[PDB]
Design a protein around this ligand. Structure first.
Ligand code: P7W
Length: 197
């Protein structure tokens, strides 16, 4: 595969629900590349603009809306044709830009689920983490509802399939545009390249 992968095992299998690998798409910097919360812990990203895109497994976060203070966002350029998007001039005039909100689901780690029961005095016997036919508990987080479409859900039982859409991520400064396409997914394969003005 001639494209990009994340530097490590990402998301709930680490034991942490909000396990985010942060990319500064303009500078090439990567945060939490070595391990979880190693450079930036959940909530510690909201007031930094030195990141543009973060991944928690295949789920993506931009520096916008509820995830951060920046001028970012995401938009959907439709099925395929990744190599064909080269220029900001090609973007539709009426393109719908969407900022991050707190309505996107990530899988809860088994350990976070357990703490959630202890903290709320809930009986483990009537609160299983893992549904034998529906898989693990999920919870909402700050993420991008447009980029969440990069992996289509069908179920139960849940099965995830790439949409193969090209998406476009606006950077934290609001003046740079990165096309992105998720090819496969705990190892993630994708393409991400800057569009020309
Ligand atoms: O600790 C949290 O993230 C909250 C845990 C809760 C769990 C509730 C559920 O999944 O039914 C939630 O989803 O917000």
């Amino acid at each position: 595969f001639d494209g990009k992968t994340l530097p490590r095992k990402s998301g709930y299998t680490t034991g942490v629900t909000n396990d985010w690998i942060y990319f500064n798409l303009r500078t090439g910097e990567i945060f939490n590349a070595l391990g979880v919360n190693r450079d930036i812990k959940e909530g510690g990203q909201m007031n930094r603009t030195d990141w543009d895109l973060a991944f928690c497994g295949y789920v993506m976060r931009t520096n916008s809306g509820t995830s951060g203070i920046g001028r970012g966002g995401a938009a959907d350029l439709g099925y395929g044709n990744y190599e064909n998007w080269t220029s900001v001039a090609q973007l539709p005039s009426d393109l719908k830009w969407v900022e991050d909100n707190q309505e996107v689901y990530v899988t809860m780690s088994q350990n976070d689920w357990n703490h959630y029961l202890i903290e709320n005095g809930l009986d483990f016997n009537s609160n299983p983490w893992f549904d034998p036919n529906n898989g693990p508990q999920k919870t909402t987080t700050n993420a991008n509802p447009v980029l969440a479409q990069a992996m289509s859900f069908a179920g139960p039982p849940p099965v995830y399939t790439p949409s193969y859409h090209t998406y476009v991520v606006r950077t934290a400064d609001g003046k740079h545009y990165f096309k992105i396409q998720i090819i496969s997914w705990g190892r993630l394969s994708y393409y991400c390249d800057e569009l020309q003005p």
